[PDB]
Structure 1
Amino acid sequence: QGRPREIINTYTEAVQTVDPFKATGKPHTLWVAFAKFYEDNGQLDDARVILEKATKVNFKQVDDLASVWCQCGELELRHENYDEALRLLRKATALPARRAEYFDGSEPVQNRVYKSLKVWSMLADLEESLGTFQSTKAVYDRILDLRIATPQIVINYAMFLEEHKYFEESFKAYERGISLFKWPNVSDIWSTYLTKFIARYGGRKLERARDLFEQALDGCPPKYAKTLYLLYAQLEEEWGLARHAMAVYERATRAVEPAQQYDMFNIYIKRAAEIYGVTHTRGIYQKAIEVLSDEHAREMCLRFADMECKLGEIDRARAIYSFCSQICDPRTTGAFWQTWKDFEVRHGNEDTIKEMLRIRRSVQATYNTQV
C-alpha cells in the first residue's frame, strides 16, 4: 500500500516487522529490501546503520548474514565508482576470513564455500567486468573456501590462468578439482584443463603430460558415457610414435567399452585398420570375438569374417561360420547362413565339400530349433 510514496512515512511501517521468532533468511532478505527502501530514502542515510545492525546476529552459524552483506556488496556495485565499494566490500569481505560459520544450529558443518566464496568473488576476481584483482586474490578465494569448492572451479581456474597462465595454476586446478568432488565431476573439467593446459603450458608432445593425464584418469569410472582413450590414445598417436600408439590402443582396448558399445569396438577395429595390417585385424578379430555381450561377437565376428574371407583363404570363413553357430542365437536370421553358403560356393566348393556345409548348417539350425 502506497509503496513508492504515500506520506513518505508508512515505508517505515513496511520496514517494521518485529515479532521475534525462529526464522532463517527472512529478516535478512526483508532487511536488504528495507535497505533498498533506504536507498530510496536518501541512499547512504540510515543504510550503514541497517547493514551494521543486521550484520551481527548471534555468532556466525547463519547463511543469511553473509547473504545480506553480499547483497550490500551488490548495492555497492550499483554505487558506480568502486573506490568506496571496494573499501567497504574489502573490510566486510575480510571479516568472514577470521570466523565463518558452525557455531550452533542445524548445520553440522560451516559450509563457507558458497557464502564466503561469493563475498570473496564479489570483492575481487569476478571474471566478468570488475578489475582490481591482485595476483594473490585467487589464493584468497581458494583460501576463502579453505577446503574445497567447485561451483566456480572452471571460472576460478580461468581467473588463475588470466592472472598467471602457468603450470602452477594448472596443477593447483588439478588438485583443487580432484579434492573438490570425487569421480569425474570436477575431475572431468580437470582433465579438459589438463589437456588444454598440457598443450598450452607443459608443451606439445610432452612425456610428463601423458604421464599425469594417464596417472589421474588411470582406473576411472566411465566418465560421462565413456572415455578411457581418445584424449590419451589420439594424443599418443599424434605425438609421432607409432609404437606406443599400438600399446595405448591395446591398453585402451581393454577399458574401451565397459558398456559393451559397438562404438569403441569400431574405434579399436578402425585403429587396427589404419595401422599395422592384416595380422592386426586378425588379432582384433579374435579379441573382438572373445569379448561378447549379446550381438557384439556375432556382428564383429561376421564383419571380420567377411573381411577375412574376401582377402585370406576360406578356412577362416568356415571356422568363422562354426564360431557363428555357437554364437548368434537363431532368432530369425537366415541371411548369414545363405551368405556363408554362397561364399563357400564361390570358394570353389560347388558340388563337393558344400554338402557338409549346407547339411551341417541346416542340421545345426534344426538342432538349435529343439522340437
Structure 2
Amino acid sequence: RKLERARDLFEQALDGCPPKYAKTLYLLYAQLEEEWGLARHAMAVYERATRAVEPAQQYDMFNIYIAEIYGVTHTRGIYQHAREMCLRFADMECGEIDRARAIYSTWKDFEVRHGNEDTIKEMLRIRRSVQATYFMASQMLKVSGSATGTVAPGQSGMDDMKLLEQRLAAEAERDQPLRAQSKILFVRSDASREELAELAQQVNPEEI
C-alpha cells in the first residue's frame, strides 16, 4: 500500500494512472481514502480533464453513502455540463424546484426542466414557458399551444394573443383556432390573425 502511495506523492503525469490507483484502494476497499484521491486529482487538472475524473467520481461516491449533505456539497464544489444534469437528476429522487433552478442555471435542457416540473404537478409547467421564451419559437410555439389551450384565464387568453403575436400556415391555423374558439367574438381577431399570417406569406414570398 505505502509502496503504491509513493506514486501518489510523486511522478504524476496522466489521470488514467490516477483512476487506476484509486481502483487499487477500491479493490482493498479503503473507500473514503479512495475518494480523497479524487480530491487530489481535481485540484490539479482544472475544468477539462477534471471532468474526466469527476464523472466516475460522482457515480461512485453517490453509490457509496447514497449521507446527502456531503455529496451534495461535493457536487456544489464540482459545479464551478451534462454531469450537472445527471447529478441533479440523482439528488431530486435520493429540494426539487431548486434542482430545476440549477438546470435553469439549450432547448433540450429547457424541455427537461419542464418535464420534471410537470412531474411535480401541472401548474409550474405553464409558468416554465414564460422562462422558456427568453428554433426556440417552435418550442415556444408548442408551449403557447399547450398554454393557449390551457387557459387567471383572461391573462391566459391575452397571453395567447401575446404569443400568437410573438412570432407557418399551421400557426395560422392555430391563431384561427384561437379566434374561432370565441363564442362569436374571435372573428375580427381571427381574420386579423389570418391577415397577419398572410403578411407572413408576403414576407416569405418576398424572400429570394
TM-score (norm 1): 0.49
Residues 166 and 227 (structure 1), Cα distance of their counterparts in 2 relative to 1, 3 Å cut: closer
* CA displacement, residues 196-224 of structure 1 (integer Å, 9 cap, x when unaligned): 12331xx22510111012212x22xx4xx
Alignment pair present for 1:355 and 2:191:
yes
Q: How does 1:311-322 map to 2 (within 5 A)?
A: 311-312=150-151, 313=153, 314-322=157-165
SS at match of 2:166: helix
Overall identity of the aligned pairs, in % = 5
Structure 2 residue aligned with 1:336, among 163, 171, 174?
Answer: 171
The whole-number CA distance in structure 2 between the counterparts of 1:156 and 1:356 is: 70
Radius of gyration: which is bigger? 1
Are 2:61 and 1:197 equivalent residues in the alignment? yes
Q: CA deviation at 1:276?
A: 4.1
Letter in 1 for 2:170: A
Cα RMSD after superposing both structures:
2.6
Structure 1 equivalent of residue 5 of structure 2: 139
Matched with 2:129 is 285
Does residue 183 (structure 1) correspond to residue 39 (structure 2)? The answer is: no
- Structure 2 CA distance for partners of 1:141 and 1:306, relative to 1, 3 Å: same
Matched AA of 1:139: R
| Correspondence for 2:22 | 157
Higher helix share: 2
> 1:211 is matched with which residue?
73
**Alignment check: 8 A CA contact 1:285 1:300 kept:** no
Structure 1 stretches lacking a partner, 5+ long? 1-134, 325-332
Aligned length: 202
Is the contact between residue 173 and residue 190 of structure 1 (CA under 8 Å) also seen in structure 2?
A: yes
Query: Aligned-pair distance for 1:139?
Result: 0.5
Distance 1:194 1:228 in 2: 10
Unaligned runs of 5+ in 2: none
Partner of 1:265: 110
Task: Give the drift of 1:322.
Answer: 0.6
Instruction: Output the amino acid matched with 2:19.
Output: V
Q: Which has the higher contact order (CA 8 A, sep 6+)?
A: 2
Structure 2 counterparts to residues 1-371 of structure 1, below 5 A: 135-145=1-11, 147-179=12-44, 181-200=45-64, 203-216=65-78, 218-219=79-80, 222=81, 226-231=82-87, 233-239=88-94, 244-254=95-105, 257=106, 262-278=107-123, 280-290=124-134, 295-296=135-136, 298-312=137-151, 313=153, 314-324=157-167, 333-348=168-183, 349=185, 351-363=187-199, 365-366=201-202
State the 1:195 CA deviation.
3.4
